[PDB]
Design an enzyme around this catalytic site. Structure first.
Site, PDB file in Angstrom:
ATOM      1  CG  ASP A 171      -9.233  16.822 -15.428  1.00 59.19           C
ATOM      2  OD1 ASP A 171      -8.647  16.147 -16.293  1.00 59.19           O
ATOM      3  OD2 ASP A 171     -10.171  16.363 -14.746  1.00 59.19           O
ATOM      4  N   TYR A 186     -16.513  18.184 -15.428  1.00 60.93           N
ATOM      5  CA  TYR A 186     -17.011  16.814 -15.475  1.00 60.93           C
ATOM      6  C   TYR A 186     -17.855  16.516 -14.240  1.00 60.93           C
ATOM      7  NE  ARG A 197      -2.835   0.041   3.330  1.00 61.52           N
ATOM      8  CZ  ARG A 197      -2.196   0.450   4.424  1.00 61.52           C
ATOM      9  NH1 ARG A 197      -1.716   1.686   4.499  1.00 61.52           N
ATOM     10  NH2 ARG A 197      -2.006  -0.385   5.431  1.00 61.52           N
ATOM     11  CE  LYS A 221     -12.423   8.699 -18.408  1.00 58.60           C
ATOM     12  NZ  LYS A 221     -13.491   7.662 -18.221  1.00 58.60           N
TER      13      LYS A 221
END
Lengths: 366, 360, 365, 362
Positions: A169, A97, A46, A194
């Protein structure tokens, strides 16, 4: 990777030598834990993982930045950044978004002040950054789904005068087309889901940045909140990344063709695309994007959107973007269902033959 | 279906057309809307993830489960539902508690082994009681049925971190708790090769909140990770029972060694809460701790040749750590307290390794 | 793995923690090629791969053998061994339809295949009198009637005649049977079955001791290219951790099911190595530590296709050894002394009472 | 895939809709076995024989050559071994390597293997005069000298004699060369190379049109068990999406490197199908849409092993076609001084500078 140009860095950034065996492709590190006596940097997955670090090294290298951090998704990257904003402090964002708005709603319930503004005008910019206790300016450019664009260099200078951090972004543009840190922003934010991964088969997010105190804070949150991606996921993102510039260049070239088809259609109204001279912020586009991108939106005038959507035989009707498969959606019915008309259509151009895509779009518009 | 059958067939949804016994791995991030209408986007919906969730829920005869990128993420999600001004009472997770505290959540620590309980639950605006049992690393136990009854009187939710015991040995929802919390990274996946977390619970409004947070915060696991967690889950009862059997053998070995002091294990007759152990655990687990009297912990740790010196627990490979040097490096935890996580190696080999390390 | 007992070798065999990083679970080596200047043992994936080698070291360790070689499938492992037999030479076998597909292929290249009864001394003597005997091919217990062949005795007799002996040890697994310890030259596996154990990867293996055999086996594997992928090797290795736990459970449950079968009025013959009346029970007691998780029986209650339709927990499908219980009718399925109503069970790790109840419902006696 | 052009077939070939869920990317079918009762039409019985993920890759590959059939294998060698198994005793193979490793095996099984020069009408005629000729085995362009064989002509002549023609099309890829359109019977691939393209999975493939061949090929694959894993098929398929993008880039950069090579004082012959002076230039133009991404050259500057050590961007190792650029010296690895380059998708100026620096020394 000093001396490596961008496309070379896509292939070799973070491609760390395998001691002993000499693997060209680094092996996939799936182990959750590590023998302490066999080392002392790796304690628990982690917190530390070589496959993750290799991807982070590559992403950082793509923007000539010292740091990057990857996450389980784009939302997690965004949530991590927002967690650094204190109750009572203010976030200014573009009005254009739905994902980030969900996060903004969450942040508001924790006492974060969210202000939406027009960052395309000097007046709108001036008013927004006049907000007291401004901690973060959140720029999406080009925006989703209307593809308006914000002058990153200008907003960054104005925001830095007021002591605020600026995040861009950069998902729509990708680092192939737009380099926010070079433009003056402090953070580049990605949904690597994406175009970065590019094959629609893995979720991921990333933050790329230069500040060391931010780095410590970002990693601290990722470790404690546990929004870490898996090693197999990082492997798929990294593998997709090799072909990022080849893919983007193709999608942009095809997007241009499709835009011409749309503009010539009697059943299309407004066409939104940064590469158009008539784009309200084209001068900014020319200043900060090397190419106008692979996302296009337009108003369909031929009837209900669903009728248009049903007629595609090659475009896939579904959400997300940036992948090898071309996608089409209607924001009102799909992503933005919870200036966006009921008949606005958004295209994400994939890497299929442009004439096949052009013919499919043309048949659909009918 | 009985428990061991649910491990294999829970959430094992038949494939239309092809008939796959092992469900295929759904890696796709997006879905064609015209071909269905439940699946829209991978961050919200994924069949492989859902199958894992169905299995986990089934193991506790619960209606709901939600999996996450890690145990920490499951915990963070649960904590996000506590509102500022409200209070959490508890027996890493403390790292998360620091985060919650700085955002206006009141965190109170209490002794939940005493009827400490009354004092703890006297806290105003009590929203959540957060129990680990057995505790780390001293393996003390908390009476879940007792605390839950008292907490429900006060309108509070009860969560049990059930990672140490696993649903094979302990059933928090059956004892009266509202939520079971897991780091599936540990014994559930069981092979030390994937990170994951889970929440298992019964309340429908909680379900809505948990999923809404997960979708928005994006702390979802990948499909390949879910595949590995699900694959490991098949052998959970086989592994756990082996681990418990061996732990018992190691405990006898420890009790006979002159360089061992206190031995902490829920299975010992002299255990301070043994009655509670017999009441809520079907077997005493595979975690053992003890005080090493032979010197600094590193003297012991350096001598293992089969146990791995490293953190985490529950997997097939046996692990050993010194909390003071390792997990608890940043409460009764001596500098020479040692914690063992027992794997599925041959018990005689493990006993011999432990004995050699202890002897020198 | 010196000093490691069997169950320990399952976990730590071929597990050397990573230099520098110290990974407990070795990383997955997917790379097809290697930088020559960074080392010089690794040149190309078809020949060399660390993930594959770790699996091989493990499998070898389970039988205290110097060598193991893994393949794309059990069939490929078998094909490789058969490739070493020259035209005009003879193979004597007890067998799997797959192995028969391969035996047919070998015959069309000039290998002589002779089938024999290897459960009796006359049959054994008759078989091994074959001229140019190169290989004796033993499956035990056999599919699907579960007869067993005395590996030690046949090996003794075959080595007198200078032949190599291979035992297909898939049914038993190295948990229950050790062909090399019994005197055989090669153990052959479909790791697809109980070794990987989760019905999600294909693989094969050969385990053996002769260095000249090792050279020939590896040369063929490289040339024929029937190598497994690294990710597949990872899944086989991961499944292998729980092999003894899984097998012991499957065996315990099988014994329970066998008793249920014996009590059923719609069941005739029951075939199981663990039964006292089994024609080779003495050999079973001598060479298997437990009688395995495969059971076959003659169903007397009506059409086999209907029996199959009535299972709700057992899966009607081919293959075996996995965590999921499987049922098939060889006459209708794998083999499309084998009656039309012979049924074969492969017992998984589900709850034994659930499996017993499913079986009883299906039998509808 | 009717109406789909090549680049579209790369993305959508074999992309079978998922019923119910509608996945855009098909799920990975890892299951080895199948419930017989769960199938409307009984098509899947056991993984060594049938697997949906494997079949989707096969459908795609077949589509790239407008062919009815394709079969994939655990490796390129396994694909080759399978085809060679179909040559019967007494019959002859005429050929232009690991394939030579395989040819030795075939010889020990009673196959007659004859090597010939297939670049001349005299050489071809002599070759095809072999009795019991069953199979003509063409590699073009060849490894490592990149000579080229006229597929149409050899196929026409070989079919006169009733023989089957196979072309190993790995170097060119279906982006650049279409052996079935040229008249051959089989296209053979190591998908390990440019088809998968990321150097992280092994695979082979056969693409062909004859239904009797199909039955025989599938029968052998099932019996010999040289099948690829579903996860491997997934990686090959995933890589395949970008095949045309990658090849076009590699070719553009190969052209740049050939110019650098032609300008070097320590380089002699340069071997590349795209050179005007190439001995088979007419054939190249007739059957390849572009001259490929492999280049070889004679190094004159000293021992090859020293040159190999000087690369900092190219990787010294075997294999080819992947995104990472590779360099090897055939005499040392796979004239004594011949170097073979496999051009990847790095920046062409970075690659040119690395090559120039290596050739120059210092």
């Amino acid at each position: 990777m000093s001396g490596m140009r961008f496309d070379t860095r896509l292939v070799h950034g973070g491609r760390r030598p395998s001691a002993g065996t000499g693997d060209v492709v680094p092996p996939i590190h799936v182990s959750t834990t590590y023998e302490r006596r066999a080392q002392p940097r790796y304690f628990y997955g982690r917190g530390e993982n070589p496959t993750r670090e290799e991807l982070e090294e590559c992403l950082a290298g793509l923007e000539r930045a010292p740091f990057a951090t990857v996450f389980s998704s784009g939302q997690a990257a965004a949530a991590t950044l927002l967690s650094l904003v204190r109750p009572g402090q203010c976030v200014v964002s573009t009005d254009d978004y739905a994902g980030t708005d969900g996060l903004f709603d969450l942040a508001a319930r924790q006492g974060v002040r969210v202000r939406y503004a027009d960052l395309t005008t000097p007046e709108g910019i001036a008013a927004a950054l006049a907000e007291p206790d401004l901690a973060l300016v959140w720029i999406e450019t080009p925006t989703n789904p209307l593809l308006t664009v914000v002058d990153v260099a200008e907003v960054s200078r104005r925001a830095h005068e007021r002591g605020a951090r600026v995040v861009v972004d950069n998902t729509f543009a990708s680092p192939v087309l737009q380099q926010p840190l070079a433009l003056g922003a402090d953070v580049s934010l990605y949904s690597t889901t994406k175009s970065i991964a590019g094959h629609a088969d893995v979720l991921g997010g990333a933050l790329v940045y230069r500040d060391a105190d931010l780095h410590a804070a970002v990693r601290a949150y990722r470790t404690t909140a546990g929004n870490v991606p898996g090693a197999l996921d990082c492997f798929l993102v990294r593998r997709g990344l090799h072909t990022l510039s080849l893919r983007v260049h193709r999608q942009v070239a095809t997007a241009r063709v499709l835009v011409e088809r749309l503009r010539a259609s009697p059943v299309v109204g407004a066409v939104h695309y940064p590469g158009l001279p008539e784009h309200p912020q084209h001068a900014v586009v020319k200043a900060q994007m090397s190419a106008p991108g692979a996302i296009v939106s337009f108003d369909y005038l031929g009837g209900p959107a669903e009728r248009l959507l049903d007629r595609f035989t090659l475009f896939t009707c579904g959400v997300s973007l940036g992948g090898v498969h071309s996608l089409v959606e209607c924001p009102a019915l799909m992503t933005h269902r919870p200036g966006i008309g009921e008949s606005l259509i958004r295209l994400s151009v994939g890497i299929e033959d442009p004439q096949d895509l052009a013919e499919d779009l043309s048949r659909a518009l009918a």
